[PDB]
Design a protein around this ligand. Structure first.
Ligand SMILES: CCCCCCCCCCCCCCCCCC(=O)OC[C@H](COP(=O)([O-])OCC(O)COP(=O)([O-])OC[C@@H](COC(=O)CCCCCCCCCCCCCCCCC)OC(=O)CCCCCCCCCCCCCCCCC)OC(=O)CCCCCCCCCCCCCCCCC
Ligand SMILES: CCCCCCCCCCCCCCCCCC(=O)OC[C@H](COP(=O)([O-])OCC(O)COP(=O)([O-])OC[C@@H](COC(=O)CCCCCCCCCCCCCCCCC)OC(=O)CCCCCCCCCCCCCCCCC)OC(=O)CCCCCCCCCCCCCCCCC
Ligand SMILES: CCCCCCCCCCCCCCCCCC(=O)OC[C@H](COP(=O)(O)OCCN)OC(=O)CCCCCCCCCCCCCCCCC
Ligand SMILES: CCCCCCCCCCCCCCCCCC(=O)OC[C@H](COP(=O)(O)OCCN)OC(=O)CCCCCCCCCCCCCCCCC
Ligand SMILES: CCCCCCCCCCCCCCCCCC(=O)OC[C@H](COP(=O)(O)OCCN)OC(=O)CCCCCCCCCCCCCCCCC
Lengths: 168, 606, 176, 50, 63, 459, 99
C-alpha cells in the first residue's frame, strides 16, 4: 500500500465530550472486545509472522524490455508484428488497471465526503474524466478483434481531421 | 473499524451456520428449529450494536470483502454499504423473524418437513439481507431473485394444491416483468458510467437519468404491489401464515421502496418520476382498500391493507420524503406481522377456517389474540402513539403541505379512512358478535412459543416509533405550521371511518335482506382485473405459441419450403432421367442429337 | 366421491340442489343465525307453495326462472368449507398421501423396524392373489348382455368372496 | 493375473509417449532460442535457455 | 439417497481434508513471499517471479 | 496436446481387449484421469498463447471447450450404461469406441490452427453421431433425423470449403494469427458478400438459426442420451468457435451483412421460447431451449464486441452443462416410464424427493438465477445489444419472461402436482444418475466462483 | 402374421440386489464401479483440479498488470506527467499522407 497511489486523506476525529452522567456501553464493549478478540488473534498473527520471518522468501516484479513498435514494422513481416502486438496487449491491460485504479480512487472519495462530494470530490472526478477521454481516444470503437494496427488506423483517422481543423 | 465490520459479517456467518447443519448428519440428532431460532436471536443481539454506534456517530461504511472478477476496466466484488437504512432494517427484520420462527415451530407441528420450512425461511432472510446491504447492483439483483424464488418455494409448500402453484408462478411472472426494468437500469448504468456501484452512480445527479428510473419504477411496481402488477400478493395467502407474515407483510414487498430510497439522490431532480409515483401509489391505497371492504378472508384483508400501505409509501416517495417512506417500512412490520400472527393463532385454534363469517366472540374466548389484534389495528389506523403516528402523521401532513396533485391528495385520505373501515370490520366480525363457528371447542393459546412472540411484537408495535424517531438524525425539515384541519386530519378521518363502519355494520342486523349491487360486486371481485387479464393474456399468448409458431411456421412451412421442396425437385428429376426403356434406337437418336449439338457449338463459337 | 352421477338428473334432484345452493348463498349473505333462520323459513315457504303441483311444463318453467333469479342474486364470494373445492385446504395433504406400492421398494434395513407391520402387509397380499380370479367372473357373469351398462358394482354373494374391485377403495391413505 | 491386469500399462504409456513427442516437437523449433528482441539474454549462468 | 449423500461426503472429505490441512500448514509455516527488487546482476528464474509456494513449486518442478 | 490425444487413442485397445466386466470401469476411470490432465492448458501466466506445434494451439477460448469435452466423456459413459445393458459386449464396446472417437476429434478441432483441418474434423464429427443415433435409437424416425442432420450440415459446409480454397489461393496459408497479422480490408463487393455467406452458413446451421433449426429437435428426440448430451454441449459450439475464428478476416462486411441474422436470432428466440410453453415432448422442449439460447450467441458474435464475445463463451459453456443435465434428468424418467410425454408422469418429488432438487437447480440455471454464468452471459449480451440499439431490450425481456415461464412449467408438470399413483415401475433413484447430476452441477458452482477461466479472448 | 419374439417385461433389480448401485447386476462389479467413479471424479479431479486451478498464479497477467499500473501512476504523478495520453503512438515517427 503506497499512500501516494492510494491517497487516503487524514482523519479529523474529535474529542468525546460526555455532557451527561449516564454511562456509554460502546466504550466498555470495545474494551471487552480488545480483551477477548484482539489479544489472542494478535498473538496468533504474531506467531505466524514469526514462522514467516524465520523462513522468508522473495519474489520479483518482472521487467519487460521494449521492442520495436508497429510503426517500424513492415507490412507483412510477422516476426516483428508478433512482438509489437504482444507489447500492445500488455499496455492495454496495464491501462485497464490504471482506469480501475482511478475508479477505485473516486468511489472512496465519494463515500468519505458523503454530502460534500459535490464540492470536495472534484479533482478526482476531473482525473476520471481526463483518463476517460484518453481511454476513449485510444480504445473506444476498435472491436472484439482489437489490435495495434486498428489503434494506429484510429490515431490516423483522428490526426487527419485534427490537421484539417488546424489549417482551417 | 474492527468491531463494526466484524459485527456486520458475524450475522451472516450465523445465518449461514444452520444451513451448514442442514447438510450435515446432525439434523436427525438436533432440535433444528430451536437451534435456528437461537441463531436468529444472537444475530439480532449482534446487529443491535452497529445501530448504537451509528445513532452515536452517524457514520456509514463501505466494506469490500472479496474480489470476484476483473472485466476489462469493470471490477465486480462483494460490497456492503452499511448505512442507516441497512443497519436499521437488519435489526427490525431479525427481531421479526425471531418471533416468526418461534410461532412457526408452534404453528407447523405435524408437518414432517418443518426442518425444510425453517431452512427456506432462513434462506429468504439471507437473500433479503443481501438485497438490503448491497453496495452493488449485481449483489442487489442476487438478493432480488433469491427473494423471488424463495417465494415460489414457500408458496407451493403444499405442492398437491393446484392453486398454490398458480400463485407461485404468478409471483414469478410479475417479478420477472419487474426484472426487465431492473436489468434495463443496470445496462444503462454499466454503459453510461462503466460501473454498477452507488458511489460512481451518484455522479449522474446532473445527467438525465429518466430511462433507468422508469426501469426501477417498473421493478418496484413488480416486487412491491401496485395497480399494474398487484394481484400476486393476495394470491400469496395460499401459503402458510408464517410466510404470509414475513414475505408479504414486512419483507419482499418493501424491496422496491428500498430500491427507490437507495436511488433517491437521482429522483430528486425528475418531476416525471416523482409525479408518476404520486399518481400511482395513491391509485393503490384506494383500489385495494376498496377491495378490503367486501372480502371475507382475514388473510386477504391483511394483504390488501399491506398493498394500501405500500401505495402510501410510494406516495411519500413521490412527494420527496424517502426517509419517511423508510420509517414507515420499518414501523409497519411490527403490527402487520402481529396481525398475521393472531390470525394464524385463531385459525390453528379453529379447524383451518379463515372466513370471518364463521367466527366470533373472540374477545372473550381468546383474550390474548383479541388484545393483540386490537393493538395492531389501532397502530395501523394511526392511534396517536402506537408506532403508526410517528410515520403516518408526518406523511399525511406533508401530503397536504407540499405542492402536489389534488386528486391523489384526496384519494389517499379516502383510503386512509377505508383503513379504519376494514379494521373495524375485522374487529366487529371476529371479536364482537356471537359465536357462529362450529360447536366443538378445543381452543388453546397457552403455549409460550405462541404467547411470547406476540407479547414481543406488541411491545415493539407500542414503543418502536418512539425509540427510533427520538434517536435517528433529522435528514428532513417538517412543517409544524398549519391549520387544525390539516394537523388533525388523519385522526379525525380515521375516527369518522370507524363510526361509518359501526353504522354500516350494525345495519348488517335489522332483518333487511342484502340486495347485491355493482359497487360491492366490483370491490369483491377485485375490479375484475384478474378475472379478465388472467384469461385473455394466457389465451392469446398460448394460442399464438401453438397455432402460429409451432404449427404454422415450424411443423408446416419451414418444412414445405426447404427440405420437402429439395426432395420433391430431386425425386422428380430422378423420375425424368430414369424413365428409360432399353431401346437402342432411342439411345442412338439421343447420341445423334449430342453429336449435332457439339458440332454446332464448335462451328458457331470457333 | 363415493358414487357416480346418473345418466341424467331428475327434476326432483335439480330442485333439491337448487334449494341447497340457495340456502348456502342465503347463509353467505346473512351472517347472523337469527337472520339465516328467518329467511330460510321464508324461502322454504316460497318452495312449499309449489310442492303439490304436477304440470311438468309449468314446473320446468318455474325452475328455469328460479335458476336465473339465483344467478342474479347469488353471493359472488360464498362460504366454502376448507377441505372442499375452492376451500383453503382442498388438496393440501396430497403431498403426504403416498400410495402403498411405495413400500415394495423399501430396503431390508428399513422394514427391519416395523416388522410386525410388514408381516400383515404380506398376508394382505395372500388375501389378494386368491380373491382376484373370482372377482372377474362375478363381473363377467353379472354382465348385462343387452348392451346397457353403468358405473355401479355389486357386492359378493358367498362366505369368503369379497366385493369386486376393492383393493383401491380399501388401502387408500388417510385424509389427515 | 496378467491376462486381466496388463491393460493398465497402455494409457500411462500413452501419456509418456505424448510427453516424449512434445519434447521432440520443441527440440525442433529451436530457432530464435535467444534471438527474440524481448528476451535476448547473455548466456552467463548456462549454455541453453530453452 | 442417504447412501449417495453419505458416499459423496466421504469421498470428497477423504481427499479434501488432507489437502486443506496441508494448505493451512503451508500458509502458516512457510507463508507467501515478499516483493523484492532484483539484484542488478542476478538472473531470476521462471518461478522466482510468483508469490505462493505451491504456485512456484509447481512451476519450478513441472513447467 | 499430444499428452491429451495419445491416451485418448489408447482408450480404444483398453476398451476392446478389456474383459467384459471391467471395460466400463477402466475406461471411465481413465477418462476421468484424462479430464484431469487436460487442466495443463489452464496454466496461462501471460497474454501469450500456447503453440505446441505447427498443427496444434490453445487459447482462452479453446481451452474451456476442450476441458468440457474431456469432462463430458465419462458422464456419457455412465449415462449410456443402463440401456444397452443387455446388448452384447461387442455392441457396447462399439458404443464406447464411438464416444471416444467423438472426444478425440472434438479435442483436435478445438486445438487446431488451420481452417481446413478444422473443417475435416468438424465434418468427421458426423459419422459417430449418425451411427449412434441410427443404431441405438428406439423410434423409426431416427433415420430421417440422421438424414436431416447429415445433409443440413454438408449443404452448409461445402461453400465453406470453397471459400477456404479461395483464401488459401489469394493468401498463401489458412493458418490462424497469420490470417490475423496479414488481414486486409475488403471492397464491399457482391463476390465478397457471397464469400461472407459461404463462410458463415455452415456454422449458422450447426448452431441452429431460427429457420434451419429443423435438425436439432429431431436428433435430440430420436437420439440416445449420450448423443443428446454431446449434440447439446459441443456440436452446437463448433459453429461458434468457427465463426469467432473466421470473422476476423471478413471485415468490414459484417457491419451490414449481419442484420438478417441478428433479426432472425432475436425473433426466433421468442418464437422458440414460446414453443417451449406448448410442446408436449420434454426432449423437444429442451431442444427449443437450446435453440433460444444459441440465438443469443449468434446475435452476439454478429456484433463483435468484447463484452459480447465474453457473454457468448460463458453462455456456451453454461448451456452445455445445463442442457446435458436436463437431458439426463428426463432420461432418468424415460428409463422408468418409456414415454417422453411430460404430463403423463406427475406428482414426483414425493418418491424422488432429491432428484426434485437437481430438477429445480437445472431450472434455476436455465432461467438465469444469479449468481450464475448463464446470467453473467445473458446480462453482457443484453448490454452489448443495448449499446448496439436500445430497442433490443424489449425482445430480451420477452424472452426472459417466457424462459421463466417454461422452466417452471417443466418443473411443475413433473414434480409439483400429485402423483400418478398407478405407476408401480418407479424403481428408486440410482446412485449412478444422482452422481451424473452432481457431476453436472458442481462444476457450475466452481465456474461461478472462478469465472476468470471462462471470459475468453478479450478479457 | 409373422415370426418374432414377444415384447419383454419390466424387471425390478432391487428385488435381487437391494444394495444395487446402478451399474451392473453383479454386486461386486456394481460396487467397484461406483467406488472407482467416486474416487476418480470426486476425490481426485474436483479436489486436485480445484486446487491446481486455484494455485495457478497470475492468470493472464491480471496481477502483474495491477502492480505495473501502480508503478506507472506513481512515476507519472510524481514527475508531473499525465496518467494517460490521447495518442498511443508518438506522432513524430508517423508520416501522414499530404492529402
Ligand atoms: C452475493 C452474496 C455473496 C454470497 C454468494 C452466495 C451465493 C448466492 C446466494 C443466493 C442464492 C439464491 C438461490 C437460493 C435458493 C436456492 C434453491 C435451494 O435452496 O435449493 C434447495 C436446497 C436443497 O434443499 P431441499 O430442497 O430441502 O432438499 C433436501 C433433500 O430432500 C435432502 O435433504 P437432506 O436431509 O439429505 O440434506 C442433506 C444435504 C447434503 O448436502 C451435501 O451433501 C452437500 C455436499 C457437502 C460437501 C461437504 C464436503 C466438503 O442434501 C441436501 O439437502 C441438498 C442435496 C443436493 C446437494 C446441494 C449441493 C449444492 C451445491 C454444492 C456445491 C459444492 C461446493 C463445494 C464442492 C467442493 C468440490 C471441490 O437448499 C439447500 O439446502 C442448499 C443450500 C444452497 C444455498 C446456497 C447459498 C448459501 C447462502
Ligand atoms: C485461537 C483462535 C485461532 C483462530 C485465529 C484465526 C485463524 C488464523 C489462521 O488459521 O490463519 C491461516 C493461515 C493464515 O495465512 P494468511 O495470513 O491468511 O495468508 C494468506 C495466504 O497466504 C493466502 O493463501 P490462499 O490463497 O491459498 O488462501 C486460501 C484460499 C482458499 O481457497 C483456495 O484457493 C484453495 C482451497 C481450495 C479448496 C480445495 C479443496 C476442495 C475440497 C473441499 O483462499 C481463497 O481462495 C478463498 C476462496 C473463497 C471460497 C468461498 C467464496 C464464496 C464465493 C461465492 C461465489 C459467488 C460470489 C458472488 C459475488 C457477486 C458480487 C458481484 O493460512 C491461511 O490463510 C489459509 C487458510 C485456509 C482456509 C481454507 C478455508 C477457506 C474457506 C473457503 C475454502 C473452503 C475449503
Ligand atoms: C492415484 C491417482 C493419481 C492421480 C494423480 C494424483 C496427484 C494429483 C495431480 C493432479 C494435479 C496435476 C494435474 C495437471 C498435470 C499436468 C502437469 C504435467 O503433467 O506436466 C508435464 C510433466 C512433464 O514435464 P516435461 O517438462 O514435459 O518433461 C520433463 C520430465 N522430467 O509431466 C508430469 O509431471 C506428470 C504429471 C502427472 C499427471 C497425472
Ligand atoms: C435447398 C437449398 C438449395 C440447395 C441447392 C444448392 C444449389 C447451389 C447453387 C447453384 C450454384 C450457384 C453458386 C455459383 C457460385 C459462383 C461463384 C461465386 O460466387 O464465388 C465468388 C466468390 C469469390 O469471388 P472473388 O474472390 O471476390 O473473386 C473472383 C473469384 N476469384 O466466392 C464465393 O462467394 C463462393 C460462393 C459459393 C456458392 C455460395 C452459394 C450461396 C451461399 C449462401 C447459401 C448457402 C446454402 C446452400 C446454397 C443455397 C442456395 C444458393
Ligand atoms: C474451465 C473448464 C470448463 C469446463 C467445466 C468442467 C470442469 C471439470 C473439471 C473439474 C473442475 C476443475 C476446477 C474448476 C474451477 C475451480 C476454480 C477454483 O479453483 O476456485 C478458485 C477460487 C479462488 O479464485 P482465484 O482465481 O484463485 O482468486 C481470485 C478470485 N477468484 O477458490 C475457491 O473458491 C475454491 C473454493 C470452492 C468453494 C465453493 C463454495 C460454493 C459457494 C456457493 C456458491 C453458489 C453460487 C451458485 C449459485 C447458483 C447456481 C445455480
Amino acid at each position: 500500500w503506497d499512500k501516494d497511489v492510494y491517497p487516503e486523506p487524514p482523519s479529523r476525529t474529535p474529542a468525546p465530550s460526555p455532557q451527561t452522567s449516564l454511562p456509554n456501553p460502546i466504550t466498555y464493549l470495545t474494551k471487552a472486545y480488545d480483551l477477548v478478540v484482539d489479544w489472542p488473534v494478535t498473538l496468533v498473527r504474531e506467531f505466524i509472522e514469526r514462522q514467516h520471518a524465520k523462513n522468508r522468501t522473495y519474489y520479483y516484479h518482472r521487467q519487460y524490455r521494449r521492442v520495436p513498435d508497429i510503426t517500424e514494422c513492415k507490412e507483412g513481416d510477422v516476426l516483428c508484428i508478433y512482438e509489437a502486438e504482444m507489447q500492445w496487449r500488455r499496455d492495454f491491460k496495464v491501462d485497464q488497471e490504471i482506469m480501475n485504479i482511478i475508479q477505485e480512487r473516486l468511489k472512496a472519495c465519494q463515500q468519505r465526503e458523503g454530502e460534500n462530494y459535490q464540492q470536495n470530490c472534484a479533482k478526482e472526478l476531473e482525473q476520471f474524466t481526463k483518463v476517460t477521454k484518453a481511454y476513449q481516444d485510444r480504445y473506444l470503437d476498435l472491436g472484439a478483434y482489437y489490435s495495434a494496427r486498428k489503434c494506429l488506423a484510429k490515431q490516423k483517422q483522428r490526426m487527419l481531421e485534427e490537421r484539417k481543423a488546424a489549417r482551417q | 473499524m474492527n468491531i463494526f465490520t466484524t459485527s456486520i459479517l458475524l450475522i451472516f456467518i450465523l445465518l449461514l451456520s444452520p444451513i451448514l447443519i442442514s447438510m450435515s448428519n446432525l439434523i436427525k440428532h438436533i432440535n433444528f428449529p430451536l437451534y435456528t431460532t437461537t441463531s436468529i436471536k444472537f444475530s439480532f443481539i449482534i446487529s443491535l450494536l452497529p445501530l448504537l454506534m451509528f445513532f452515536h456517530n452517524n457514520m456509514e461504511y463501505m466494506i469490500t470483502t472479496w474480489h470476484w472478477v476483473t472485466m476489462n476496466s469493470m471490477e465486480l466484488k462483494m460490497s456492503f454499504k452499511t448505512d442507516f437504512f441497512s443497519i436499521l432494517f437488519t435489526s427490525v427484520a431479525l427481531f421479526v423473524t425471531w418471533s416468526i420462527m418461534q410461532f412457526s415451530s408452534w404453528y407447523m407441528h405435524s408437518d414432517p418437513n418443518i426442518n425444510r420450512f425453517i431452512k427456506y425461511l432462513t434462506l429468504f432472510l439471507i437473500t433479503m439481507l443481501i438485497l438490503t446491504s448491497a453496495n452493488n447492483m449485481f449483489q442487489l439483483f442476487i438478493g432480488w431473485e433469491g427473494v423471488g424464488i424463495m417465494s415460489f418455494l414457500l408458496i407451493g409448500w403444499w405442492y398437491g394444491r393446484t392453486d398454490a402453484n398458480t400463485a407461485a408462478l404468478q409471483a414469478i411472472l410479475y417479478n420477472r416483468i419487474g426484472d426487465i426494468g431492473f436489468i434495463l437500469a443496470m445496462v444503462w448504468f454499466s454503459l453510461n458510467m462503466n460501473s454498477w456501484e452507488l458511489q460512481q452512480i451518484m455522479f449522474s445527479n446532473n445527467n438525465d437519468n429518466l430511462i433507468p428510473l422508469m426501469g426501477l419504477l417498473i421493478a418496484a411496481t413488480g416486487k412491491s404491489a401496485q395497480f399494474g402488477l398487484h394481484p400476486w400478493l393476495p394470491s400469496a395467502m395460499e401459503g402458510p401464515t408464517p410466510v404470509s407474515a414475513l414475505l408479504h407483510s414486512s419483507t419482499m414487498v418493501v424491496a422496491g421502496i428500498f430500491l427507490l430510497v437507495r436511488f433517491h439522490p437521482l429522483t430528486t431532480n425528475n418531476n416525471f418520476i416523482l409525479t408518476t409515483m404520486l399518481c400511482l401509489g395513491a391509485l393503490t391505497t384506494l383500489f385495494t382498500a376498496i377491495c378490503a371492504l367486501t372480502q371475507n378472508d382475514i388473510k386477504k384483508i391483511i394483504a390488501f391493507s399491506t398493498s394500501s400501505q405500500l401505495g402510501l409509501m410510494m406516495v411519500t416517495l413521490g412527494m420527496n420524503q424517502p426517509h419517511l417512506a423508510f420509517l414507515h417500512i420499518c414501523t409497519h412490520a411490527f403490527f402487520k406481522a402481529m396481525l398475521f400472527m393472531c390470525s394464524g393463532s385463531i385459525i390453528h385454534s379453529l379447524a383451518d377456517e379463515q372466513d370471518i363469517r364463521k367466527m366470533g366472540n373472540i374477545t372473550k374466548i381468546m383474550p390474548f389474540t383479541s388484545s393483540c389484534l386490537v393493538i395492531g389495528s389501532l397502530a395501523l389506523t394511526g392511534m396517536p402513539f402506537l408506532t403508526g403516528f410517528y410515520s403516518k402523521d408526518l406523511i399525511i401532513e406533508a401530503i397536504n403541505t407540499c405542492n402536489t396533485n389534488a386528486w391523489a391528495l384526496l384519494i389517499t385520505l379516502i383510503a386512509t379512512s377505508m383503513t379504519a373501515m376494514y379494521s373495524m370490520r375485522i374487529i366487529y366480525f371476529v371479536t364482537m358478535t356471537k359465536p357462529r363457528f362450529p360447536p366443538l371447542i378445543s381452543i388453546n393459546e397457552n403455549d409460550p412459543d405462541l404467547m411470547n412472540p406476540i407479547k414481543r411484537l406488541a411491545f415493539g408495535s407500542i414503543f418502536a416509533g418512539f425509540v427510533i424517531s427520538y434517536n435517528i438524525p433529522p435528514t428532513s425539515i417538517p412543517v409544524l405550521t398549519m391549520p387544525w384541519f390539516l394537523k388533525t386530519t388523519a385522526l379525525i378521518i380515521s375516527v369518522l371511518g370507524f363510526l361509518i363502519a359501526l353504522e354500516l355494520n350494525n345495519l348488517t342486523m335489522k332483518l333487511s335482506m342484502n340486495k347485491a349491487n355493482p359497487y360491492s360486486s366490483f370491490s369483491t371481485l377485485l375490479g375484475f382485473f384478474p378475472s379478465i387479464i388472467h384469461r385473455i393474456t394466457p389465451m392469446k399468448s398460448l394460442n399464438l405459441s401453438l397455432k402460429t409458431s409451432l404449427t404454422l411456421l415450424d411443423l408446416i412451412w419451414l418444412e414445405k419450403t426447404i427440405p420437402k421442396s429439395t426432395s420433391t425437385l430431386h425425386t422428380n428429376m430422378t423420375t425424368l432421367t430414369t424413365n428409360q426403356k432399353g431401346l437402342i434406337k432411342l439411345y442412338f437418336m439421343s447420341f445423334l442429337i449430342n453429336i449435332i449439338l457439339i458440332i454446332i457449338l464448335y462451328s458457331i463459337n470457333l | 366421491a363415493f358414487c357416480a352421477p346418473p345418466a341424467y338428473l331428475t327434476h326432483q334432484q335439480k330442485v333439491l340442489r337448487l334449494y341447497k345452493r340457495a340456502l348456502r348463498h342465503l347463509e353467505s349473505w346473512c351472517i347472523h343465525r337469527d337472520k339465516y333462520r328467518y329467511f330460510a323459513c321464508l324461502m322454504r315457504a316460497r318452495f312449499e307453495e309449489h310442492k303439490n303441483e304436477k304440470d311438468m311444463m309449468r314446473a320446468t318453467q318455474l325452475l328455469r326462472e328460479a335458476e336465473e333469479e339465483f344467478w342474479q342474486n347469488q353471493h359472488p364470494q360464498p362460504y366454502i368449507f376448507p377441505d372442499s373445492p375452492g376451500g383453503t385446504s382442498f388438496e393440501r395433504y396430497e403431498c403426504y398421501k403416498v400410495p402403498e406400492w411405495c413400500l415394495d421398494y423399501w430396503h431390508p434395513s428399513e422394514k427391519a423396524m416395523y416388522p410386525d407391520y410388514f408381516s400383515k402387509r404380506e398376508q394382505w397380499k395372500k388375501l389378494r392373489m386368491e380373491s382376484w380370479d373370482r372377482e372377474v367372473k362375478q363381473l363377467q357373469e353379472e354382465t348385462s348382455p343387452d348392451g346397457i351398462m353403468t358405473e355401479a358394482l355389486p357386492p359378493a354373494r358367498r362366505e369368503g368372496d369379497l366385493p369386486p374391485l376393492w383393493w383401491h377403495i380399501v388401502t387408500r391413505p388417510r385424509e389427515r | 493375473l496378467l491376462r486381466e491386469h496388463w491393460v493398465h500399462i497402455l494409457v500411462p504409456a500413452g501419456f509418456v509417449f505424448g510427453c516424449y513427442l512434445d519434447r521432440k516437437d520443441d527440440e525442433k523449433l529451436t530457432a530464435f532460442r535467444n534471438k527474440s528482441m524481448l528476451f535476448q539474454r547473455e548466456l552467463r549462468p548456462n549454455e541453453e535457455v530453452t | 439417497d442417504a447412501r449417495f449423500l453419505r458416499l459423496m461426503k466421504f469421498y470428497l472429505m477423504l481427499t479434501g481434508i488432507p489437502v486443506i490441512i496441508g494448505i493451512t500448514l503451508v500458509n502458516i509455516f512457510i507463508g507467501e513471499a515478499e516483493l523484492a527488487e532484483i539484484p542488478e546482476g542476478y538472473i531470476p528464474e521462471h518461478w522466482e517471479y510468483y508469490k505462493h509456494p505451491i504456485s512456484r513449486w509447481i512451476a519450478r518442478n513441472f513447467y | 496436446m499430444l499428452k491429451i490425444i495419445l491416451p485418448s487413442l489408447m482408450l480404444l485397445p483398453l476398451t476392446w481387449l478389456s474383459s467384459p466386466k471391467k471395460t466400463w470401469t477402466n475406461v471411465t476411470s481413465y477418462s476421468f484421469l484424462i479430464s484431469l490432465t487436460s487442466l495443463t492448458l489452464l496454466w496461462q501466466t501471460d497474454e501469450n498463447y500456447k503453440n505446441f506445434s505447427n498443427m496444434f494451439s490453445s487459447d482462452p477460448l479453446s481451452t474451456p471447450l476442450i476441458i468440457l469435452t474431456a469432462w463430458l466423456l465419462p458422464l456419457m459413459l455412465m449415462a449410456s450404461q443402463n440401456h444397452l445393458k443387455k446388448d452384447n459386449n461387442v455392441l457396447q464396446k462399439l458404443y464406447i469406441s464411438m464416444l471416444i472417437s467423438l472426444q478425440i476429434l472434438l479435442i483436435m478441432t478445438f486445438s487446431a490452427t488451420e481452417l481446413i483441418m478444422f473443417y475435416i474434423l468438424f465434418e468427421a464429427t458426423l459419422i459417430p453421431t449418425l451411427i449412434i443415433i441410427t443404431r441405438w435409437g428406439n423410434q423409426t424416425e431416427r433415420l430421417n433425423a440422421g438424414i436431416y442432420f447429415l445433409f443440413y450440415t454438408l449443404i452448409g459446409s461445402i461453400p465453406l470449403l470453397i471459400a477456404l480454397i479461395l483464401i488459401q489461393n489469394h493468401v498463401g496459408t489458412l493458418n490462424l494469427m497469420i490470417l490475423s497479422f496479414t488481414t486486409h480490408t475488403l471492397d464491399a463487393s457482391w463476390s465478397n458478400n457471397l464469400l461472407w455467406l459461404a463462410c458463415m452458413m455452415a456454422f449458422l446451421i450447426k448452431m441452429p438459426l431460427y429457420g434451419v433449426h429443423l435438425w436439432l429437435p429431431k436428433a435430440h428426440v430420436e437420439a440416445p442420451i449420450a448423443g443428446s448430451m454431446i449434440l447439446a454441449a459441443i456440436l452446437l459450439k463448433l459453429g461458434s468457435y468457427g465463426m469467432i475464428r473466421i470473422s476476423i478476416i471478413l471485415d468490414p462486411l459484417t457491419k451490414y451483412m449481419a442484420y438478417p441474422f441478428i433479426l432472425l436470432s432475436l425473433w426466433g428466440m421468442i418464437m422458440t421460447s414460446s414453443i417451449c410453453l406448448r410442446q408436449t415432448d420434454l426432449k423437444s422442449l429442451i431442444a427449443y431451449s437450446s435453440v433460444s439460447h444459441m440465438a443469443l450467441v449468434i446475435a452476439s458474435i454478429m456484433i463483435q464486441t468484447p463484452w459480447s464475445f465474453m457473454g457468448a463463451t460463458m453462455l456456451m459453456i453454461a448451456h452445455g452443462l445445463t442442457s446435458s443435465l436436463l437431458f439426463c434428468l428426463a432420461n432418468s424418467n424415460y428409463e422408468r416410464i418409456h414415454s417422453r410425454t411430460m404430463i403423463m408422469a406427475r406428482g414426483l418429488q414425493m418418491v424422488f424427493p432429491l432428484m426434485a432438487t437437481w430438477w429445480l437447480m437445472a431450472s434455476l440455471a436455465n432461467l438465469a438465477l444469479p449468481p450464475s454464468i448463464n446470467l453473467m452471459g445473458e446480462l453482457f449480451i443484453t448490454m452489448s445489444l443495448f449499446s448496439w440499439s436500445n430497442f433490443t431490450i424489449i425482445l430480451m425481456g420477452i424472452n426472459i419472461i417466457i424462459t421463466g415461464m417454461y422452466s417452471m412449467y417443466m418443473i411443475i408438470t413433473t414434480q409439483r402436482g400429485k402423483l400418478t399413483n398407478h405407476m408401480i415401475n418407479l424403481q428408486p433413484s440410482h446412485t449412478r444418475e444422482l452422481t451424473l447430476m452432481a457431476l453436472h452441477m458442481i462444476p457450475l458452482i466452481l465456474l461461478t466462483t472462478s469465472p476468470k477461466l471462462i471470459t475468453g479472448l478479450t478479457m | 402374421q409373422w415370426q418374432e419374439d414377444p415384447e419383454p417385461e419390466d424387471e425390478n433389480v432391487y428385488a435381487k440386489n437391494p444394495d444395487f448401485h446402478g451399474y451392473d447386476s453383479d454386486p461386486v462389479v456394481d460396487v467397484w464401479n461406483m467406488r472407482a467413479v467416486f474416487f476418480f471424479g470426486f476425490s481426485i479431479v474436483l479436489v486436485f483440479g480445484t486446487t491446481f486451478v486455484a494455485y495457478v498464479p497470475d492468470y493472464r497477467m491480471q496481477e502483474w498488470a495491477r502492480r505495473e499500473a501502480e508503478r506507472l501512476v506513481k512515476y507519472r504523478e510524481v514527475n508531473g506527467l499525465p496518467i494517460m495520453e490521447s495518442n498511443y503512438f508518438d506522432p513524430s515517427k508517423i508520416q501522414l499522407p499530404e492529402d
